[PDB]
């Protein structure tokens, strides 16, 4: 079986980022095993859009994209595709047009190479004010992109109510760019979230399963 295997290693080593700084791994030509990756964690929920868990690990794609980040299970309610929670409003949104999955899993004691952050952080509001008109335009994050407020919010929220702001250049209107941090206490076992987005090619699907 020739082909380079998909390298899921970067998520096993280090601290998984916060949800608004989700780490993105793209796979274009791979042999992959999702069961192999998931046997390492204690999966809590595994919900998909326009695909099912059995089919997502069983098919060939033209590209496979894996987002992972620290995410507590206490906020499972706000992490869905059709969601209206603050997460899928200003923190992390995945594509409409593509088949999609959303995984919550806890990292067990068998894994001591994934380090913990001090706390769970997410952006509860990010909005933009114009100079001449102070009408607030909430920067609803676009699919597969980062919040514009990643430029001003740090890697981890320090206190639950922290407030971040940046003044904009007169090119873009000269307004103010503003964000609010919000925090969740870290748990004894780190909890994470994974996003999967896949593209089927019209001609070639080279990211193929283990067999």
């Amino acid at each position: 079986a020739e082909g380079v295997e998909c390298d899921f290693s970067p998520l096993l080593s280090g601290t998984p980022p916060q949800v608004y700084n989700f780490k993105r791994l793209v796979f274009t030509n791979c042999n992959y095993n999702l069961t192999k990756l998931l046997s390492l964690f204690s999966v809590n929920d595994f919900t998909c859009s326009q695909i099912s868990p059995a089919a997502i690990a069983s098919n060939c794609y033209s590209s496979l994209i894996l987002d992972y980040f620290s995410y507590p299970l206490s906020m499972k309610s706000d992490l869905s595709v059709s969601s209206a929670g603050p997460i899928s409003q200003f923190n992390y949104k995945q594509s409409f047009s593509n088949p999609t999955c959303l995984i919550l899993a806890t990292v067990p004691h068998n894994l001591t190479t994934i380090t913990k952050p001090l706390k769970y952080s997410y952006i509860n509001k990010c909005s933009r004010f114009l100079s001449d008109d102070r009408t607030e335009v909430p920067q609803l994050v676009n699919a597969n992109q980062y919040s514009p407020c990643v430029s001003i919010v740090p890697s981890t929220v320090w206190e639950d109510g922290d407030y971040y702001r940046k003044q904009l250049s007169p090119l873009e209107g000269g307004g103010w760019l503003v964000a609010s941090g919000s925090t969740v206490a870290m748990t004894e076992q780190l909890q994470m979230g994974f996003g999967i987005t896949v593209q089927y090619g019209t001609d070639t699907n080279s990211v193929c399963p283990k067999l």
Partner: nanobody
Amino acid sequence: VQLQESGGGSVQAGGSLRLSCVASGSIFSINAMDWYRQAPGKQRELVAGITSGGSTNYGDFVKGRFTISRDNAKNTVYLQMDSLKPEDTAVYYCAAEVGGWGPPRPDYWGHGTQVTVSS
């Protein structure tokens, strides 16, 4: 709640100066504190600001010359000003934002200290 300023005085052009604003305020619910200045007959304009989250932001006329800092341990904010020029002559105020969101609309102001610059 009260804001008090120190450090104001006359300084010749190109020199340095530091103002300080201790907030003996009833509340710690200030989420940003800002420095403004009012030059003889110009609009009161924003010079520098620091926030709850520590994001620093400055007025459009200081070319890295001014630097704002806060130590929450002493309830005080410093504004160190370098390479001053006569155009920086104004009465400087420090201000606090309670539940501030977006453009600075300060809810408490200080009595203002005056800085003058002669060339």
